[PDB]
Amino acid sequence: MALFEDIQAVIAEQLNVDAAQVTPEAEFVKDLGADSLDVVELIMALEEKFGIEIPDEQAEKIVNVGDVVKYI
Amino acid sequence: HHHMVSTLKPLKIGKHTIKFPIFQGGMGVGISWDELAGNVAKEGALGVISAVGTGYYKNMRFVERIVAKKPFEALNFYSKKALNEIFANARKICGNNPLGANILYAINDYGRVLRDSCEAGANIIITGAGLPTNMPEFAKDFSDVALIPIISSAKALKILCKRWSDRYKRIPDAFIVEGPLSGGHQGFKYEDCFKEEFRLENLVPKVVEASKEWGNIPIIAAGGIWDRKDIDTMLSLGASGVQMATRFLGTKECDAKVYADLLPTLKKEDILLIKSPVGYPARAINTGVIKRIEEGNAPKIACVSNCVAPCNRGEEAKKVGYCIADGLGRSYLGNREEGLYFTGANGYRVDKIISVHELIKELTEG
Ligand SMILES: Cc1cc2nc3c(=O)[nH]c(=O)nc-3n(C[C@H](O)[C@H](O)[C@H](O)COP(=O)(O)O)c2cc1C
Ligand SMILES: *P(=O)(O)OCC(C)(C)[C@@H](O)C(=O)NCCC(=O)NCCSC(=O)CCCCCCC
Ligand code: SF4
């Protein structure tokens, strides 16, 4: 819960969307309006604030915010 | 009247040098294979073998499973056996001159095809259709192969240089900047395309500027470059080289033989920007599948090859109207009613089909 809101605030700030609509089912591209460049940036932004790597082979599998949350 | 020597300077990319600063852009399916890229390399530019949909090579000669007369799954569509043969046949013509391999990042089995491409003998990997953030991961056994992403903005350069250095302490040996006049898929805002800001004469200064901050990465301009005058324009704007596809699409050595019949008839009114399962706009010729869709006569969509990941096996193909693996595959096979055909914006200017040698002469003389 503490983790989910921290990474919620980061997604909302990166993609310029309301935190209230950054829900576990929300897809970054379909639902939150981000392109490829936005997602890579977001992945880089998460890596810093949490000191992990998320190799591309998992980033290809995350798709929505809830999957990102679990990986962390 | 005699052939005349160039004042163009040789171009060096990573460990490899080409006599003219010219890439022949990769073109799938079966468009820039052995004949086209081998002869380009023979003539002193970069020949670039497209590695997408190679299972179609020699009418699926090298596939091991066929379903609906189409290569079944990425394992067969991106055939290691076929790709090695094309490199084998390309080296017949060009010897050990440098050959690129082109691989969309969108495809399934991306990593496998890059190592198949290195193992086939490629000297340079070229990757667009996506932001290839992990490209050195798959090339790690092949420190001689240069890696060249395709980008359409300075932002993409900055992003990729940061990831590759963070992760690998490596930087791309070159970047191809592709403008909105290009053939195939666009690196551009679905909407934008004709805005003044995105014009290639404007991108190249911006990308070269950004490239200075990372050790002066060589920037290759592509999209709408027609003749030596266009070449000189791009070089004067900071580019180290140009990539060109439509002019080579109109040569005899083009491996997709249907294009020699099609291009002399092509009119500007039949070049159109369409939707694609890959997820990017594509510049296509209003013929083949594109006519069959508007007629209501379009072939059936049943994902057999599973060429690209963004499609989710029919979901995007059914919504756009066509399977791009099947449509490009049929074109290589001569199917004019229901093949898919691409071109750059300059394709209507292709009036006569000439040879690679004659094209190379036009572009480099003086
Ligand atoms: C028929 C055709 C197929 C293409 N296929 C690919 C491809 O498979 N991979 C790629 O990176 N670019 C592809 N392109 C883009 C070219 O490699 C090149 O970047 C662009 O066409 C250059 O612009 P020009 O055609 O105006 O010279 C294709 C272009 C054409 C015309
Ligand atoms: P993201 O949304 O995925 O955003 C990525 C982005 C912005 C498009 C970049 O990768 C970028 O700047 N790209 C330039 C890539 C290219 O412009 N071009 C190479 C495209 S591959 C191609 O043109 C056609 C392929 C034809 C054959 C299809 C075979 C199945
Ligand atoms: S249905 Fe989609 S994934 Fe399958 S071959 Fe066609 S374009 Fe590729």
Numbering used by the authors:
A (entry chain B): 1 to 72
B (entry chain A): -2 to 363
Paper text:
We demonstrate that the [4Fe–4S] cluster functions as a temporary electron depot that receives electrons from FMN and sends electrons back to FMN to achieve independent bidirectional internal electron transfer.
In the FabX–octanoyl-ACP structure, one of the complexes in the asymmetric unit is well determined, while the ACP in the other complex only shows the key α2 helix. Octanoyl-ACP binds FabX predominantly via electrostatic and hydrophobic interactions between its highly conserved α2-helix and the α7-helix of FabX. In contrast, in the FabX–octanoyl-ACP complex, the sidechain of D56′ of ACP α3-helix inserts into the chink between helices α6 and α7 of FabX. This pushes away the sidechain of N131 located on the loop between α6 and β4, and forms additional hydrophilic interactions with FabX R164 and T130. The anticlockwise rotation of ACP on the α7-helix of FabX poises the octanoyl chain plus the thioester proximal portion of the PPant prosthetic group to insert into the “L” shaped hydrophobic tunnel of FabX through the oxyanion hole between FMN and H182. In the FabX–octanoyl-ACP complex, the PPant is stabilized predominantly through hydrophobic interactions with the FabX sidechains of S149, I147, Y277 plus the backbones of G127 and G184.
